[PDB]
């Protein structure tokens, strides 16, 4: 009668451990998903950080190309303007002689 | 979603280990009771053996006694009956010596 | 870092439930052994009681028997002795009748 | 003796159920932490996506600016070089007259 | 799919041993009832043998007792008749002594 | 490792359930023998009871017979004692008539 | 003698069921570990698939970006070549006039 | 009557051990199927890892190709645009001569 | 059930037949003793007839001897009586002469 | 099979009991006739004994009667004889006077 | 005397034969009843054996009906599967023409 | 004469009662043999009943196994069957383009 009760008790405990074990399998599936979600996010962060680096570097290099081109064009404009002025003077000098 | 369903399951699982600890308590109670009752039952067995052994040794010795008395009486009866018979014969031989 | 610790915990918990189930297995065996031993012990009590009652009854009836046989013998012996005596007197009367 | 084993079984079971509880506590702390990371990380993804956009748009606008500067400088260069030659001819025409 | 059928099979294998275990108990009870009845049967056989022997003894002794009252009474009757006869002679002798 | 441990557990089980079957065969043998052995004990009980009823009828009737002889002898002794007493009185009256 | 063997038999049968149960407990543990492992594995497959997908989507996007850039540069390169040829023709047309 | 209930219990027991044998067979098959499946699962993990790597390497190679195309087109865009500016000044130089 | 009652009746009938066998021994003995008694009574009748014959013969002869003695003594008594009378007349005649 | 043999043995037992019953009627008649016979012999012994006692006592008495008669006659003979002798002497005396 | 004892035993014998008759009636009823029972028992055994044969036969037939249903489905499944494979290769061939 | 016929009848009765005794033994054996039969029949019935129950259990279980197999096969078949139809319509659509 006391062996009845105990035995019943131990059997309920068995069925409950089994209910528990299951939930441990739901838990685990839950972590794993949560891990994957986080791992994925950490991946994107890294991917995007790298992209931002590359895009800074490319944009920076392209600017320094163009600015190099601008300066070269300026030096050539300087010489062309010098030449114009030189010719303007030399024009007014010749202009006086005859008229 | 899945962070939540996994959490939900760890929570449930936690709750259930309270049920378990209860069944384990009932079970503990059953075993302690079972031990008390075994102790009662063995005392009885021991008391009963003791009585039976007491009762045998006594009966065996008592039977021995009465059987010694019986054989003794038998040897006496044999003699006394052989004595009657021999006097009966002796008598009849003498009474013929008269009549 | 926390995803891992948590998952670890869920797996460990699992390992633990096994251990649980194992002790539950042992607890179940114990109570089945206990019920078997109780059932046996009750049977012994009843066996022993019934052997005590049968040993008392037997002893008391054997004592009856043997005492019966004794007093019978006593009555026979008294009679044989009383017969010897009277045959001894009757002899002495007839022998005086000759000498 | 079998009650002894069993009840010991049940006491270990109890102790195991505690260890279980503990591990389930840790599992729960870790989910929550894992969830919280997901949130922080998703922010940084959304923040980095927006910075990458802002940087593509900005760089594109700077290039367009500098490219606009280069064409202007090219127009000026042409015009000056035109002006140089126009003077040169007009110079030699004036040159001829007097000498 | 298979891991689940396996577990499902084991859990049924367990339920069914528990069935085996009850039948073992019934089985155990049946053998003990058998011994008890055999042992009862033997008790009754011995008690009847002892009653038989005691009845033969009580009857032998009762036959002795009564036969001893019978022969005692005979001797008294025979004596009472010899006393009658001798007082009848002695009477006649005296009445002759008068008339 | 864990699939193997279980597989191994299931194989051992399978072997174990064979042993079980063996013992269950022995158990079946044991009961079938018993039912045979039990009818014998009853036959004897019945026989012995028959003997004991028979042996009691004989005594009761024998006791009837002798008790009848006894009461007959008593009534014969009555008359004879009533005679002695009347002759004793008659005697005493006559011997007063002499002394 | 036969109730001996039958009983001994049933008692062995019992100790055998304990052995059974033990092995069933190990089998249940194995299935549960095998399913936990299955769940990890299915999860990994899924994580890995989804990473493979995201790697292809990323690369697919980056390629489309670059290929648009290439078409732009070809539209610009054509124009420049069209302009070179136009100027060559207009160069030779003006070349013929004077010379 | 108790021999019966004992024997019937033993007969059920025996039948039951046949069902046990069968469930143990299912259980054994299940473990073997589970094992086969783990092996397929590890294969797919391996393939998928290996494909992820190839995809990373492939994409990196495709980009590097396209970036090589983009720098080429840019060098050609430079040479044509020098050529066009050279021609534009040589157009306006000749342009003024005649008009 | 019905097999017990019948077996019971057959065992009762067996004991009854042992009785019957005993009462037939008693009946046999009676007839043999009663025949011995008829024989003895017949001898006695014959001896009593022999004795009555002997007694009547002896008696009748004695009477005759005495009756003959008587008549002889009658004859002698007449002769003497007649002589007396003759001598009285003869004496009275001589008495008349003398005186 | 066994139930037919038995039933048959029972029904033969029945018929034999009927035969028994018949012989016992005859036995009963024997005794009754034998007792009637012994009565008649007893009357004959008693009549013969009484005829014997009458014959003897009668005859002894007759003898005394005759012997007394004989002595009475012997006395009368002596008187007659004495008278003759007296008358012969008395006559011879008167004879001596006369002649 | 001896004739009374005999006559008494014969009257007892008679009354014993009446008892015997009674018991024989009971034995006869016993046999008739036990034969009726044997018939019934043997009817039950025959019905059960037939029932057990039905049941085996029914199960064995039902297995065959299902296994045969299974092999058919396996044929259909192989045709269908075969057809998919065929169509896929046929589709890929047409797919190689078009794109 | 009558004391012969009566002794004769007692002698014959004595020989009959030996006959009776013989029949009773036979009747006895008959019962003991009929009882043993009854017991054998009873075991057989029980055995058959237990056999039947096992056969119904084992059968029912086999069916379940097969019916379950049947359903899983009906599932697979529907997928393959849907896949064919699908590829047929898909194939006819590509067949319409080409020819
Ligand atoms: Ca342990
Ligand atoms: Ca093990």
From Swiss-Prot, chains A, B, C, D, E, F, G, H, I, J, K, L:
<keyword id="KW-1003">Cell membrane</keyword>
<keyword id="KW-0832">Ubl conjugation</keyword>
<dbReference type="GO" id="GO:0005794">
    <property type="term" value="C:Golgi apparatus"/>
</dbReference>
<dbReference type="GO" id="GO:0005886">
    <property type="term" value="C:plasma membrane"/>
</dbReference>
<dbReference type="GO" id="GO:0034341">
    <property type="term" value="P:response to type II interferon"/>
</dbReference>
<keyword id="KW-1133">Transmembrane helix</keyword>
<dbReference type="GO" id="GO:0070665">
    <property type="term" value="P:positive regulation of leukocyte proliferation"/>
</dbReference>
<comment type="subunit">
    <text>(Microbial infection) Interacts with ebola GP protein.</text>
</comment>
<dbReference type="GO" id="GO:0042113">
    <property type="term" value="P:B cell activation"/>
</dbReference>
<dbReference type="GO" id="GO:0009986">
    <property type="term" value="C:cell surface"/>
</dbReference>
<keyword id="KW-0075">B-cell activation</keyword>
<dbReference type="GO" id="GO:0043231">
    <property type="term" value="C:intracellular membrane-bounded organelle"/>
</dbReference>
<keyword id="KW-0175">Coiled coil</keyword>
<keyword id="KW-0812">Transmembrane</keyword>
<feature type="topological domain" description="Extracellular">
    <location>
        <begin position="1"/>
        <end position="99"/>
    </location>
</feature>
<keyword id="KW-0945">Host-virus interaction</keyword>
<dbReference type="GO" id="GO:0043123">
    <property type="term" value="P:positive regulation of canonical NF-kappaB signal transduction"/>
</dbReference>
<comment type="subunit">
    <text>Parallel homodimer; disulfide-linked. May form homotetramers under reducing conditions. Isoform 1 and isoform 2 form homodimers and also heterodimers with each other. Dimerization is essential for its antiviral activity. Interacts (via cytoplasmic domain) with ARHGAP44. Interacts with MMP14 (via C-terminal cytoplasmic tail). Interacts with LILRA4/ILT7. Interacts with RNF115.</text>
</comment>
<dbReference type="GO" id="GO:0016020">
    <property type="term" value="C:membrane"/>
</dbReference>
<dbReference type="GO" id="GO:0032956">
    <property type="term" value="P:regulation of actin cytoskeleton organization"/>
</dbReference>
<comment type="function">
    <text>IFN-induced antiviral host restriction factor which efficiently blocks the release of diverse mammalian enveloped viruses by directly tethering nascent virions to the membranes of infected cells. Acts as a direct physical tether, holding virions to the cell membrane and linking virions to each other. The tethered virions can be internalized by endocytosis and subsequently degraded or they can remain on the cell surface. In either case, their spread as cell-free virions is restricted.</text>
</comment>
<keyword id="KW-0336">GPI-anchor</keyword>
<dbReference type="GO" id="GO:0002737">
    <property type="term" value="P:negative regulation of plasmacytoid dendritic cell cytokine production"/>
</dbReference>
<feature type="coiled-coil region">
    <location>
        <begin position="18"/>
        <end position="99"/>
    </location>
</feature>
<comment type="similarity">
    <text>Belongs to the tetherin family.</text>
</comment>
<dbReference type="GO" id="GO:1901253">
    <property type="term" value="P:negative regulation of intracellular transport of viral material"/>
</dbReference>
<dbReference type="GO" id="GO:0030308">
    <property type="term" value="P:negative regulation of cell growth"/>
</dbReference>
<keyword id="KW-0449">Lipoprotein</keyword>
<dbReference type="GO" id="GO:0008191">
    <property type="term" value="F:metalloendopeptidase inhibitor activity"/>
</dbReference>
<keyword id="KW-0967">Endosome</keyword>
<keyword id="KW-0325">Glycoprotein</keyword>
<dbReference type="GO" id="GO:0035456">
    <property type="term" value="P:response to interferon-beta"/>
</dbReference>
<dbReference type="GO" id="GO:0005771">
    <property type="term" value="C:multivesicular body"/>
</dbReference>
<keyword id="KW-0391">Immunity</keyword>
<dbReference type="GO" id="GO:0042802">
    <property type="term" value="F:identical protein binding"/>
</dbReference>
<dbReference type="GO" id="GO:0009615">
    <property type="term" value="P:response to virus"/>
</dbReference>
<dbReference type="GO" id="GO:0035455">
    <property type="term" value="P:response to interferon-alpha"/>
</dbReference>
<dbReference type="GO" id="GO:0016324">
    <property type="term" value="C:apical plasma membrane"/>
</dbReference>
<dbReference type="GO" id="GO:0003723">
    <property type="term" value="F:RNA binding"/>
</dbReference>
<dbReference type="GO" id="GO:0030336">
    <property type="term" value="P:negative regulation of cell migration"/>
</dbReference>
<dbReference type="GO" id="GO:0035577">
    <property type="term" value="C:azurophil granule membrane"/>
</dbReference>
<dbReference type="GO" id="GO:0045071">
    <property type="term" value="P:negative regulation of viral genome replication"/>
</dbReference>
